[PDB]
Design a protein around this ligand. Sequence first.
Ligand code: ANP
Ligand code: ANP
Ligand code: MN
Ligand code: MN
Lengths: 180, 179
Amino acid sequence: GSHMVPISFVFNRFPRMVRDLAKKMNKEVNFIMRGEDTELDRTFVEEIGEPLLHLLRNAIDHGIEPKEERIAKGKPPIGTLILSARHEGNNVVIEVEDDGRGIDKEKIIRKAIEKGLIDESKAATLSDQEILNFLFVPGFSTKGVGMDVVKNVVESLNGSISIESEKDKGTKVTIRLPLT
Amino acid sequence: SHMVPISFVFNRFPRMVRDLAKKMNKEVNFIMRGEDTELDRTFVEEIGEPLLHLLRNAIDHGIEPKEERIAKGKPPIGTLILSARHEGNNVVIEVEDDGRGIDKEKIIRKAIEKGLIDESKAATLSDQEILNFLFVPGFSTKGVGMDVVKNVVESLNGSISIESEKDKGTKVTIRLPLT
Ligand SMILES: Nc1ncnc2c1ncn2[C@@H]1O[C@H](COP(=O)(O)OP(=O)(O)NP(=O)(O)O)[C@@H](O)[C@H]1O
Ligand SMILES: Nc1ncnc2c1ncn2[C@@H]1O[C@H](COP(=O)(O)OP(=O)(O)NP(=O)(O)O)[C@@H](O)[C@H]1O
Ligand SMILES: [Mn+2]
Ligand SMILES: [Mn+2]
């Protein structure tokens, strides 16, 4: 830990950015930030901004549903978006979690069958992790930003990123950064 | 009798980039984008060598060794991005790295040595006048150099431009006509 700085140097600029993205996409979202005092290498702080912003925009765009939809679906009217940082052994863990509609895994499945990557029979055997990983295959999604770009930036930092989601329950993206 | 995906050009690069970076002991995350982008089939064989040369330049002269990336406060692993797309009536091909960038001082020194410029004119050269020296035929040592890349690009009736910032990186853009 030579050049450690609180992750607040990258976090504090998000509340305003989230609020304006919500207004633009007509989404009502309660934004929560946890662990802004978590220390990490300054190089990361200066490079993780683009990535996080993209995960936050994804949550607001594809995740949280318009209030009128959440209401019709029987969910808390206002959406919740949580950006947090914490320590797990010699790793700094940053997470972006929403209680939105969740990643549409069938949509992914159909796209993979369409690109000839898998056939029907095979698609019925895939695990959620295998499905969600298609989101990291370059060129898989239609646009440059994207999950492709988030994984590459994160890994150029010797970091790791994972995803998990449950239909109508929400989505959570996890980024692990190394202790320097 | 016309278009084919640029993948016929891009396919062999990952392996050559991995092998190249490994030989010069550089950490490189190679990213290829838009390989489905189409271009005239008569460009395939001619744009290959020039493109490989730009990647080799990035790995060799661009991306710095780990300890050097670390001292500069940069991501440990260098990023080399090759991308193709259709913008207008042409195909756009970009080769960008987040390395140390082109040593402009060194280019000016070579320019003077090659009689391309007097030293009295070096002090006020713009970054574009400097970088353009690389396009002057006979500038590079030997083989292919930036001068040969520009010539091949010209023979395809397209254009090329360079952009570079010290310690930030270099981006080479090639625009080729579609029809
Ligand atoms: N938080 C989320 N909640 C629900 N779906 C998500 C979320 N994040 C991503 N997705 C889905 O995953 C697919 C890909 O995300 P991504 O690679 O960021 O692409 P993009 O949003 O489609 N377009 P681009 O704007 O070019 O990145 C999205 O298109 C959504 O279908
Ligand atoms: N991506 C780059 N990053 C930093 N410097 C670069 C890059 N590309 C080129 N250069 C510099 O620009 C000068 C010329 O490149 P070029 O015209 O390709 O010649 P070359 O290096 O002499 N040929 P070779 O030895 O055949 O690879 C180089 O000598 C480098 O110092
Ligand atoms: Mn996106
Ligand atoms: Mn060279």
